[PDB]
Amino acid sequence: ADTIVAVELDTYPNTDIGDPSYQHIGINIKSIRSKATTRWDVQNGKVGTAHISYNSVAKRLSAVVSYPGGSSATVSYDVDLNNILPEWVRVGLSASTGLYKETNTILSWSFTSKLKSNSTADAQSLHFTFNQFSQSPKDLILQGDASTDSDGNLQLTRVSNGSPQSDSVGRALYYAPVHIWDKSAVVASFDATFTFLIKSPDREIADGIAFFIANTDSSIPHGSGGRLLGLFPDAN
Amino acid sequence: ADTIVAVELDTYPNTDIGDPSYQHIGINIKSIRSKATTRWDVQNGKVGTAHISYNSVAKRLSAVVSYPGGSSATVSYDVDLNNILPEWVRVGLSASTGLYKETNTILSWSFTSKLKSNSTADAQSLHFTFNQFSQSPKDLILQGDASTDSDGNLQLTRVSNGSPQSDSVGRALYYAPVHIWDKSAVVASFDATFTFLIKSPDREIADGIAFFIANTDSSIPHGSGGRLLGLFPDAN
Amino acid sequence: ADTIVAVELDTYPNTDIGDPSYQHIGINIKSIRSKATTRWDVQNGKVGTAHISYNSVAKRLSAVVSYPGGSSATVSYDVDLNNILPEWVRVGLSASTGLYKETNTILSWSFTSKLKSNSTADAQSLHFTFNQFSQSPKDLILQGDASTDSDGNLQLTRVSNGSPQSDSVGRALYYAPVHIWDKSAVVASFDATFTFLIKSPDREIADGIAFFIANTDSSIPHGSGGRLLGLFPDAN
Amino acid sequence: ADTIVAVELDTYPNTDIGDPSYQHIGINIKSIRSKATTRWDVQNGKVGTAHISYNSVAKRLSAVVSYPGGSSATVSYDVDLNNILPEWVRVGLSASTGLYKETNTILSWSFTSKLKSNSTADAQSLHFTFNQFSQSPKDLILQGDASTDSDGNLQLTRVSNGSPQSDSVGRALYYAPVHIWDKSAVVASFDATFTFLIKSPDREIADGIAFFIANTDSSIPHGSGGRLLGLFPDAN
Ligand SMILES: CO[C@H]1O[C@H](CO)[C@@H](O)[C@H](O)[C@@H]1O
Ligand SMILES: CO[C@H]1O[C@H](CO)[C@@H](O)[C@H](O)[C@@H]1O
Ligand SMILES: CO[C@H]1O[C@H](CO)[C@@H](O)[C@H](O)[C@@H]1O
Ligand SMILES: CO[C@H]1O[C@H](CO)[C@@H](O)[C@H](O)[C@@H]1O
Ligand SMILES: [Ca+2]
Ligand SMILES: [Ca+2]
Ligand SMILES: [Ca+2]
Ligand SMILES: [Ca+2]
Ligand SMILES: [Mn+2]
Ligand SMILES: [Mn+2]
Numbered sequence: 001a002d003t004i005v006a007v008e009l010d011t012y013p014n015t016d017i018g019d020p021s022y023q024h025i026g027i028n029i030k031s032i033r034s035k036a037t038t039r040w041d042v043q044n045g046k047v048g049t050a051h052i053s054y055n056s057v058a059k060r061l062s063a064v065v066s067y068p069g070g071s072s073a074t075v076s077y078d079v080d081l082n083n084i085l086p087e088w089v090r091v092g093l094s095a096s097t098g099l100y101k102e103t104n105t106i107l108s109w110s111f112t113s114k115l116k117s118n119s120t121a122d123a124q125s126l127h128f129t130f131n132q133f134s135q136s137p138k139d140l141i142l143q144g145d146a147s148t149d150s151d152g153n154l155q156l157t158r159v160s161n162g163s164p165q166s167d168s169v170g171r172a173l174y175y176a177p178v179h180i181w182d183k184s185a186v187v188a189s190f191d192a193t194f195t196f197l198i199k200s201p202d203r204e205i206a207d208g209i210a211f212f213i214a215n216t217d218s219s220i221p222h223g224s225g226g227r228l229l230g231l232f233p234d235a236n
Numbered sequence: 237a238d239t240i241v242a243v244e245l246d247t248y249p250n251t252d253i254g255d256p257s258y259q260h261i262g263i264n265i266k267s268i269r270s271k272a273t274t275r276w277d278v279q280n281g282k283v284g285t286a287h288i289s290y291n292s293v294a295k296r297l298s299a300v301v302s303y304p305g306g307s308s309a310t311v312s313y314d315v316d317l318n319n320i321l322p323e324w325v326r327v328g329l330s331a332s333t334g335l336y337k338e339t340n341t342i343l344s345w346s347f348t349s350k351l352k353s354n355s356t357a358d359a360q361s362l363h364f365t366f367n368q369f370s371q372s373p374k375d376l377i378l379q380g381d382a383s384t385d386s387d388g389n390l391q392l393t394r395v396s397n398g399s400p401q402s403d404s405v406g407r408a409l410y411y412a413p414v415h416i417w418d419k420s421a422v423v424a425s426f427d428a429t430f431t432f433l434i435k436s437p438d439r440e441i442a443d444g445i446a447f448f449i450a451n452t453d454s455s456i457p458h459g460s461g462g463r464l465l466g467l468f469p470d471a472n
Numbered sequence: 473a474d475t476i477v478a479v480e481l482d483t484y485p486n487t488d489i490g491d492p493s494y495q496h497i498g499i500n501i502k503s504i505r506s507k508a509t510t511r512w513d514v515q516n517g518k519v520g521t522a523h524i525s526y527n528s529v530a531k532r533l534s535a536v537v538s539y540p541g542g543s544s545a546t547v548s549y550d551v552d553l554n555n556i557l558p559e560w561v562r563v564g565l566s567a568s569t570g571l572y573k574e575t576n577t578i579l580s581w582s583f584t585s586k587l588k589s590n591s592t593a594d595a596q597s598l599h600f601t602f603n604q605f606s607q608s609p610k611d612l613i614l615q616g617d618a619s620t621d622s623d624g625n626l627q628l629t630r631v632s633n634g635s636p637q638s639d640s641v642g643r644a645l646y647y648a649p650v651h652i653w654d655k656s657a658v659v660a661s662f663d664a665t666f667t668f669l670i671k672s673p674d675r676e677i678a679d680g681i682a683f684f685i686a687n688t689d690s691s692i693p694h695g696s697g698g699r700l701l702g703l704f705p706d707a708n
Numbered sequence: 709a710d711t712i713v714a715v716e717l718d719t720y721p722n723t724d725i726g727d728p729s730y731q732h733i734g735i736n737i738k739s740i741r742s743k744a745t746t747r748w749d750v751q752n753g754k755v756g757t758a759h760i761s762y763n764s765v766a767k768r769l770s771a772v773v774s775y776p777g778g779s780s781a782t783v784s785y786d787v788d789l790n791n792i793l794p795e796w797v798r799v800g801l802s803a804s805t806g807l808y809k810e811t812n813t814i815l816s817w818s819f820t821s822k823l824k825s826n827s828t829a830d831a832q833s834l835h836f837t838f839n840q841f842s843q844s845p846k847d848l849i850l851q852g853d854a855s856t857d858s859d860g861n862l863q864l865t866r867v868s869n870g871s872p873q874s875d876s877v878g879r880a881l882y883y884a885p886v887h888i889w890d891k892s893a894v895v896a897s898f899d900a901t902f903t904f905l906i907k908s909p910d911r912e913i914a915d916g917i918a919f920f921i922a923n924t925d926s927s928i929p930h931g932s933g934g935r936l937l938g939l940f941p942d943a944n
């Protein structure tokens with residue numbers, strides 16, 4: 001199957017697959033059953049920001065999600081990613097809805113990865129930023145229901161005339177493979193930021209957004225809708 | 237055919253296609269017959285650096301090539317690239333040899349492109365750096381004879397046991413399409429740097445190296461070896 | 473006196489010192505009497521963006537100022553800055569009001585300077601970004617009436633209870649001297665962006681905002697209020 | 709006194725102040741008696757690289773020091789720096805010799821600091837790189853014996869006709885204060901890299917190099933030579 005590392009912004013508690021009984025941010029290593037979670041209160045209709053970082057010396061994957069006005073939730077997990085991920089990966093954003101629904105709108109996304117050696121100059125590095133998305137982006141792979149709208153936003157799941165739809169799944173991956181580690185590298189690091197808008201006319205919302213790193217040929221698994229966030233074929 | 241903008245480092249004068257009678261750097265817009273050239277004295281066996289820049293407000297494409305110890309050659313040409321290039325391009329390095337030959341070795345390559353709007357934050361941007369090349373690079377498209385060697389260098393044309401070979405052509409393109417202009421952008425700019433080593437056991441060398449920007453599906457044209465630098469099918 | 477290179481956003485025509493009879497953007501080299509201008513229509517109360525760039529190979533200083541919704545004005549001037557500016561400079565923003573007045577509010581400011589040599593790695597470089605300004609910024613030199621407000625904006629000229637005041641002048645300089653050229657550099661370049669809000673309850677407004685580069689010990693000249701934008705002691 | 713956080717490259721074991729009995733890298737929080745150390749074998753006469761990173765979500769300060777050819781040593785320490793350091797700091801490099809001596813030569817130094825908020829755009833950020841040092845650097849504060857030489861290197865301690873001298877101490881601080889945290893910031897991070905050459909004609913060498921972060925008005929304490937690395941007035 002795919003090899004997935006993800007940070008989920010999980011807006012609906014599914015306690016049979018080990019979610020806590022509240023909305024949460026989580027770090028997922030090869031499974032939907034998060035290795036670490038923290039309570040996170042979703043603000044329906046407000047723009048939030050997530051920042052994710054990792055460095056191979058520290059071996060600590062951390063994420064923080066915040067809204068304007070002081071509310072922030074952080075989660076970290078110690079793991080050596082060189083022994084989880086393959087050498088070449090693609091990075092992406094995924095989201096889903098199920099019975100309950102929400103917009104999963106991405107307003108901006110930046111990512112940096114560096115492979116360092118014996119110099120201030122990196123052996124290899126990549127940095128991209130999108131603060132607006134093109135109508136027909138040649139540098140993104142859009143999967144499932146993902147599309148860009150006339151406002152320049154990335155809509156990971158279906159929205160019709162301003163209302164989000166049930167049972168939708170979509171992902172966007174950056175087109176270039178990322179060289180996330182190398183046997184000569186002394187340090188490898190990456191940092192990602194994205195801003196998002198989760199909104200729904202309903203009080204009950206689902207299912208969430210995830211930032212993920214996968215094998216380069218990753219596609220949406222069959223049966224990964226709803227609680228599996230378009231990332232996993234099952235809940236093991 | 238392809239749409240090509242290139243900066244050539246031309247090591248062999250072919251005066252029937254309009255080269256000056258000396259080695260030179262040139263700016264090529266859709267033709268091998270450079271729109272602007274400057275004399276450039278190749279230092280066989282030394283590492284040189286090229287820096288190339290363009291900004292859509294200034295509308296001036298400039299290049300400088302230098303060797304350690306003070307020797308530098310610059311060339312510029314005023315042109316509106318929005319009316320030459322398509323919206324999406326790939327960027328790359330090309331080189332060739334013919335009857336005369338040289339190594340066309342690339343030691344490092346960096347590129348930045350930005351599309352700016354009404355903020356310090358770019359609408360879109362891309363930056364990559366390679367100070368070493370991987371043995372099997374998933375983020376480069378290698379065409380023709382191009383390969384990476386065990387030292388981590390990019391060899392655009394064939395070298396066997398340390399000697400360069402005649403009648404070789406090769407190119408390397410960065411894998412991701414680059415969004416080089418957009419109808420909403422207020423400014424688009426790009427900057428590229430690469431370092432190279434042209435060496436040959438012979439006093440007479442050929443044919444040169446070019447940095448180029450092309451339509452995304454660009455491939456080596458038939459008959460583009462030698463003086464056409466792997467860029468053009470003919471000398472019109 | 474000081475040595476000043478500036479890009480002015482001039483909101484009030486003073487035709488006795490050679491302004492055109494309309495609002496304009498201008499490039500100023502050691503004098504208020506701009507070497508190049510372009511018509512610019514100020515949108516009272518809207519946030520605008522300016523982008524300024526220079527590269528020592530191209531020898532073209534360019535600026536563009538734009539507002540959301542497609543309105544943009546550009547100006548360029550060819551000049552070798554190595555023969556105008558000293559080796560070490562400070563960079564800054566200046567503004568003034570006179571009989572007529574406006575807010576001269578800076579919302580964000582970014583600057584990059586690079587001195588390049590024979591590598592992808594710069595010999596020296598500096599990049600700073602402010603998207604918010606601190607209440608007591610230790611990394612800015614504030615001169616005259618300049619202050620930061622409780623919203624995190626930089627107010628270059630006096631505002632009292634939301635109204636701008638007449639006969640005010642203020643500047644902000646970045647604290648570190650910038651090494652803008654070096655006798656070993658093959659290329660020197662800089663790029664600056666800032667966003668601003670010029671607003672006034674009056675239909676008639678003055679005097680403008682300038683981005684400037686000066687000798688490191690530059691201070692506001694006596695008598696530089698109003699039309700001289702806090703940059704020059706006289707109109708020669 | 710000063711408030712110092714430092715990463716030491718300690719080339720001489722002083723076991724009365726708690727050094728291990730071997731050369732080591734260490735993380736120092738307000739004291740020379742390192743909170744964490746790792747064995748590090750100095751290669752006399754070879755160029756090494758150090759990389760240091762911290763992020764306020766992860767709260768893990770990490771350092772790695774490496775030489776070409778695969779030899780690397782890493783150390784990390786978990787600490788909340790917001791509760792150690794003041795809001796504004798200067799960053800710097802320090803070194804010393806005592807009875808035993810070595811060159812403490814810095815060949816390059818890069819530093820980045822970011823204060824992040826609710827956007828891909830940083831609230832504030834600073835990045836500088838030096839791959840060569842100017843003869844009279846206006847953007848560094850040189851303290852004690854520190855000087856730049858005709859090769860463009862930074863010599864933190866005295867060298868005469870290619871030989872290092874005993875009982876020398878010197879530091880270099882970047883001129884601009886760095887805004888290392890802010891009460892509105894969601895994340896603060898910094899990353900530093902430098903390359904160095906420790907060489908001596910003697911088999912026994914001392915005392916080491918440190919990267920440090922201090923209160924902005926930090927000066928070399930009296931009696932901080934030798935084992936105290938120019939950082940502390942005593943060994944408490
Ligand atoms: C009732 O279950 C359905 O709806 C929820 C909420 O959307 C999803 O988590 C789940 O996978 C199913 O699709
Ligand atoms: C003699 O002509 C051949 O060799 C030169 C030098 O290599 C090339 O420029 C040319 O295209 C031919 O291949
Ligand atoms: C009437 O002249 C005054 O007001 C204008 C507009 O503010 C300024 O340009 C000028 O320098 C004087 O201060
Ligand atoms: C013998 O002690 C002296 O020399 C060593 C080695 O240089 C230093 O660590 C110490 O502080 C003293 O200066
Ligand atoms: Ca869930
Ligand atoms: Ca030729
Ligand atoms: Ca005027
Ligand atoms: Ca010691
Ligand atoms: Mn969950
Ligand atoms: Mn030619």
Ligand SMILES: [Mn+2]
Pocket residue numbers: 480482491492496498506
């Ligand atoms: Mn004017």
Ligand SMILES: [Mn+2]
Pocket residue numbers: 716718727728732734742
């Ligand atoms: Mn020690």
